[PDB]
Design a protein around this ligand. Sequence first.
Ligand SMILES: Nc1ncnc2c1ncn2[C@@H]1O[C@H](COP(=O)(O)OP(=O)(O)OP(=O)(O)O)[C@@H](O)[C@H]1O
Ligand SMILES: Nc1ncnc2c1ncn2[C@@H]1O[C@H](COP(=O)(O)OP(=O)(O)OP(=O)(O)O)[C@@H](O)[C@H]1O
Ligand SMILES: Nc1ncnc2c1ncn2[C@@H]1O[C@H](COP(=O)(O)OP(=O)(O)OP(=O)(O)O)[C@@H](O)[C@H]1O
Ligand SMILES: Nc1ncnc2c1ncn2[C@@H]1O[C@H](COP(=O)(O)OP(=O)(O)O)[C@@H](O)[C@H]1O
Lengths: 489, 496, 48
Amino acid sequence: NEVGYDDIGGCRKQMAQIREMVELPLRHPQLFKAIGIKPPRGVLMYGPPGTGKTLMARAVANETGAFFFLINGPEVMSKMAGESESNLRKAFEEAEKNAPAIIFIDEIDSIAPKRDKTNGEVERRVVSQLLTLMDGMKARSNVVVIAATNRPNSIDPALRRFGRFDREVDIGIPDATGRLEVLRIHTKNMKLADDVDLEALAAETHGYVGADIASLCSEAAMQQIREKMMDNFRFALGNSNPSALRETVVESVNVTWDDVGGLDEIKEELKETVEYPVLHPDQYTKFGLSPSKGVLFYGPPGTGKTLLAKAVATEVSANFISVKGPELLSMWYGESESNIRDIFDKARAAAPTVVFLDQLDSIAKARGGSLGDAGGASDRVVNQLLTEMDGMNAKKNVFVIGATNRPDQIDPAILRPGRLDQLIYVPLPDENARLSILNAQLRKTPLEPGLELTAIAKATQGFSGADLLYIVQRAAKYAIKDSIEAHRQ
Amino acid sequence: NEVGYDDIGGCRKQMAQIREMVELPLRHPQLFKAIGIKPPRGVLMYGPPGTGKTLMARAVANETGAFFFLINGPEVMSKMAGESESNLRKAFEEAEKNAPAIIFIDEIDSIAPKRDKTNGEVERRVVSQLLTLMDGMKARSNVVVIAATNRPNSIDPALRRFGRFDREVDIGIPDATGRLEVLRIHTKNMKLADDVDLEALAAETHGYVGADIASLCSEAAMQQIREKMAEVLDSLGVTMDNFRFALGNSNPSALRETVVESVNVTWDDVGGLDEIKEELKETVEYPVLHPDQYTKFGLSPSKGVLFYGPPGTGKTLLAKAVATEVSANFISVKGPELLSMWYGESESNIRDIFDKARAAAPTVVFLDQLDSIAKARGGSLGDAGGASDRVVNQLLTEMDGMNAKKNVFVIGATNRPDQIDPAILRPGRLDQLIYVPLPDENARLSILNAQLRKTPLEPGLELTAIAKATQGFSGADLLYIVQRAAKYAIKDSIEA
Amino acid sequence: QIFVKTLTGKTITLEVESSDTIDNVKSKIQDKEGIPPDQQRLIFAGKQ
Ligand SMILES: Nc1ncnc2c1ncn2[C@@H]1O[C@H](COP(=O)(O)OP(=O)(O)OP(=O)(O)O)[C@@H](O)[C@H]1O
Ligand SMILES: Nc1ncnc2c1ncn2[C@@H]1O[C@H](COP(=O)(O)OP(=O)(O)OP(=O)(O)O)[C@@H](O)[C@H]1O
Ligand SMILES: Nc1ncnc2c1ncn2[C@@H]1O[C@H](COP(=O)(O)OP(=O)(O)OP(=O)(O)O)[C@@H](O)[C@H]1O
Ligand SMILES: Nc1ncnc2c1ncn2[C@@H]1O[C@H](COP(=O)(O)OP(=O)(O)O)[C@@H](O)[C@H]1O
């Protein structure tokens, strides 16, 4: 209804640069007269839908007192191509009559798609009306247009050229302190007790979009109502599903660097490559090239390869692209080299972001001039791998990890400084690393301190760490049976 | 003529979830909902077609005395854009002036389909007005919109936000205790009946929804009139074999699609294999019977059990009794059933069942005969071996990449246990090394308790004499000594 | 280990916009449209 500036946070660094983009040309239009140039007209926002894209425009509208015009995306484009061009003509004419005014539109990708091979849509007569309407009207008129969309790369490139939509903001998912701020906002009216937490409740979410905070609060409040005929927040996480459900942004395992033990020749050797350019890049611009992207992990089965995959992904709280081994789906002949490229461009958009792969080295088997071969896959997708891995940029500093279990079939062209070069053998856990791994896994178990795991490390000499995970699982599965035969009598 | 209070069997254990979102805004808004929590208005009823929602929404309006509405999906949206908007706008302003009111909407999938390939923009016009009108009713409007559909994943994810649609209730297929009230409703209108209880007939009709049961009482009543042609109403008392005639020409609702129901097999139908039974009572039953025990220690139980032995024992046939005890679904896939015909046409057909394995939970998946995939790690170095290296890493990464908190389990039973892949015998995927040989020679008399029970001479010492004769007799060959009864005893006893 | 690729093609529409049958217009003329407030319309009599 009547929202203000203090209702949302997280994007406060972007909220400050928005307040100089839509409020400064409206409240002080004479400042651009002194500098000579015209004030900007179009600023667009993007990101995941449900971070408050529609609530952000209504917050800055009520905090300025200006006119607030709204044209919906999938509403005015569903007409029969004749009333949409007059609705946009009525939109700019009414905003000029009652200046100062803002114009907020949402879902502009439904209005402005891209031109592709699947022609047959209308795709015209509406966006071209917006082109000839927006390039004028700059005769020091107090009007601005604000666009909003979900996918920022499905928009037509003619809009983001100059003078129509030139400034962009990236309101994404908040950090651990960002979800902590919106947790205090959405719980200002619920009479909670002193047993609830705020920092631990924000840190246990780690992937929750801001729309989920209103739903997770109402689910825990409804459970407290039902028990009349307040730690029900953990009950709400077990019942409700988090948003961005089946995407590549999964975070449900919250294993940190404390829960994984040993391998100190890998923990400090992963701190050297993927946390140094993403935190201190001032020394990397004068000491050669910045990024150390590729890193290889090889060893015995169950040596702890993917146990450290999500651990580094939650230390800097960046995104984690979990691509499996046979993800080259290969439905035809040409898309198998194309479905690996858009996930690399997505890593450049959400940079920095760790990418994972598994056993995709197949140029040693792609010999020249033979008969036994596939129809275009596993012999030409390595030719795409020889040109899409070193596609770097100084403004992104991405990094890609790689875990395998066979270091004998490494390609002679993939063991190169332009490719994944830093190969590190992941060894067996010795008698000192056996205690550091297993004690961090039974931290959740309310065990007795009489049983020390030094006898387990003396009984396990050539055992892997995953085999030691079966021992604490068997000790917990019989502690369940010890707890089953405790309440029945 | 209107519906009663409940009037539908097999839903009273879940009818309170739909009911409790109705009276609590109106019967107590002072001490229960004046804390600062807005009332949720959007529910979502779904399930198989024939569970009776359309009515269930009529039952809550009769039980509370609220005003009822009727809006069909493809009916109002098939009109013009201005015509469907005027019927939508006049329905919500009518529901405001007679609070409490219930606005029933059916077939959401026809109005809001998925946007992966459904091109064109004629569907997004009407669904934008539904989310618009669901906002400005915050204060005292006692309205609860009921959205009726079939599949929850076919609905758009934009409808499932805060305040728009929150409750996803699912009325399921009732059991024999649930469908007995459905048979009790459609037989009290009958004049007479037999001296046989309806639970004896409803025991075999397990996967039969309660829309078909409303027809089977009428499907056997007309044959009673056809059998003759109180003077003509004495034939109206139905018999127990006319239900078997109605079951003889029955059209099962589970037969109209793939059969994913739970069979009625138990543990008393087999003899022996008790060391496997005590091990298979802890892996998949203890998370689903006592869900709070493993969360105290913070360690989820092991997901995956592996069997290996001769093809004579019941290692692939007793796995159905594991899931059906706690009423879980059973999905049996075979190793040399789906393969890579073209190129890469198997990895997409492996992860296509993992999403529905956790949506309709509890389900299990039964991988069988892994001698076509788990044999090739470093032995086969041909062109088929290069394709073998591409198909085995799909299931190897899916064993630890699956959601282990949605009670999904893998059960394996594979011959030739020497050449198994070493990355599948690791803990977490298949760690229960349970050898399944032929059953013991003293536990072979208890196999024959299921198929035959009636014998006027009562044997059992000659059957154990040939069982104790040699150890080479299989667990299925001695089951066939009573399968040949139609060639031994039933053949020379029906000539009368 | 092979593929099948095929494209498609469409034809959009043509229209005529034919309407206004003559029997609807003859009923459209003989009606009223309303008169402000005091704009009576009168009667008259004569020819005894
Ligand atoms: N700072 C915040 N960050 C995230 N969510 C917020 C914040 N403040 C409030 N919210 C909640 O999130 C919701 C905002 O969602 P919004 O209305 O933007 O939907 P949307 O799908 O993003 O909009 P659109 O339809 O334009 O995509 C509000 O209902 C509000 O309760
Ligand atoms: N530091 C460690 N050393 C040994 N084992 C570990 C360590 N940390 C975790 N583990 C255990 O090992 C398992 C890691 O298995 P993962 O599949 O990630 O690697 P892997 O066993 O080498 O598999 P693969 O051989 O396919 O790479 C986890 O389930 C975990 O319990
Ligand atoms: N408790 C019950 N469970 C299942 N079926 C019932 C029950 N009580 C009655 N029935 C029978 O099942 C039918 C209910 O089907 P219904 O009218 O809901 O069709 P539907 O396809 O579910 O509705 P919709 O068209 O909204 O999907 C009734 O005709 C009734 O005879
Ligand atoms: N305990 C048992 N004793 C003898 N035969 C059995 C037993 N359990 C199952 N069978 C028979 O075996 C079949 C199911 O298992 P089976 O087909 O032998 O699996 P597999 O061939 O993989 O060992 C059934 O058709 C059943 O007749």
